[PDB]
């Protein structure tokens, strides 16, 4: 289960690999065009909504 | 896939004909409009030649005619009472060509006091309260009063039309196809039309 992250304020894209099932529990059971607090990806991803 | 061919059916002698070519595109048919009443909805469909035909599904008002002195005003559709084709098509509120409906009597009445200056409607026991028409009666000259007097020297109509005018609804007929142009035009019923269709309604409702 991969993740593609784009930053629209400068148009920079990269992909990260998430092999841990506990990090994607917040992502599951959601629709499109909704804001999810990505507070589980890591220490530098505190206070991010995607 | 509704076809309009003349080769699905038997011949003049009664013998069956065998079809040789399938359904073409000029040979086309479409489902019925079933023009109801309510807030106005009109759809467009592209036809042969690139033209458009307005499919009136629901409508409110109509542009009827009253031919005794040739006036036409926009008039609201009230209720359908008779259809010469199908007896089910009065139970469902459907509009077709040469159909029999009731329309409201207000703008023809306003035209009647504003042109002929005689009261129409306004049944006894309640007179003209909001004081607008006698304002128009006053501040005239002698020539204009002579012109109105020579005009209303002959101001007689049918008594059944008068009774419909106290009743507030005029029995009307539709002379337009709503599934082709999208509007509901026509003319009000007068003369022998009124007695014939009133006889038909009183025979059917009895």
């Amino acid at each position: 289960m991969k993740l593609n992250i784009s930053f629209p304020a400068t148009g920079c894209q990269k992909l990260i690999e998430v092999d841990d099932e506990r990090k994607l529990r917040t992502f599951y059971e959601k629709r499109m065009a909704t804001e999810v607090a990505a507070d589980a990806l890591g220490e530098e991803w505190k206070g991010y909504v995607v | 896939g509704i076809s309009r061919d003349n080769w699905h059916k038997r011949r003049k002698t009664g013998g069956k004909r065998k079809p040789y070519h399938k359904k073409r595109k000029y040979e086309l048919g479409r489902p019925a409009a079933n023009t109801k009443i309510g807030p106005r909805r009109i759809h467009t469909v592209r036809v042969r030649g690139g033209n458009k035909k307005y499919r009136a599904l629901r409508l409110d008002v109509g542009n009827f005619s009253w031919g005794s002195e040739c006036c036409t005003r926009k008039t609201r559709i009230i209720d359908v009472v008779y259809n010469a084709s199908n007896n089910e098509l009065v139970r469902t509120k459907t509009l077709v060509k040469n159909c029999i409906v009731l329309i409201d009597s207000t703008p023809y009445r306003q035209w009647y006091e504003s042109h002929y200056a005689l009261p129409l409607g306004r049944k006894k026991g309640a007179k003209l309260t909001p004081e607008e028409e006698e304002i128009l009666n006053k501040k005239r000259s002698k020539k204009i009063q002579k012109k109105y007097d020579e005009r209303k020297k002959n101001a007689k109509i049918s008594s059944l039309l008068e009774e419909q005018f106290q009743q507030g609804k005029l029995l009307a007929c539709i002379a337009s196809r709503p599934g082709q142009c999208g509007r509901a035009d026509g003319y009000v019923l007068e003369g022998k039309e009124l007695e014939f269709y009133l006889r038909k309604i009183k025979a059917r409702k009895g």
Binding site: - | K12, G67, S68, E69, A84, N98, N154, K156, E190, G191, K192, E193, F196, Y197, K200
Partner: protein, 151 residues
Amino acid sequence: DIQTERAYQKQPTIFQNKKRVLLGETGKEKLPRYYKNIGLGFKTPKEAIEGTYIDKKCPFTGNVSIRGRILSGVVTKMKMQRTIVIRRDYLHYIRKYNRFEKRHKNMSVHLSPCFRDVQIGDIVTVGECRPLSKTVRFNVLKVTKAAGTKK
């Protein structure tokens, strides 16, 4: 005698509810009659002028035109209403056997109530029209009586 069915029958050229000065007598209650000359040297009869029948497929008082072919035939049966069947007897030639054969091709034409003095065997002429029915294409222009019937 008229107004038999569930809708009013009228001629959509004239206005039948003109407002007179009086709406009484002496000038009213004689409705105008719509008629036209069909052409091709044919003369309209008086029954289409002073009659009271209402049609939409009559060549004289109606909305149908006359163009194309002019044919003739003998009236065979008068069973179905407002239209009749005529019989055309013609001769066919064979090149191999230099001898003729007679053939008949009966077909249905339209009879307006203007011509009601029609019995079996009367010679009529017809003119081509637009299709008025599934098998009806022709309108009768005049009627000619057969032999006898001196009464």
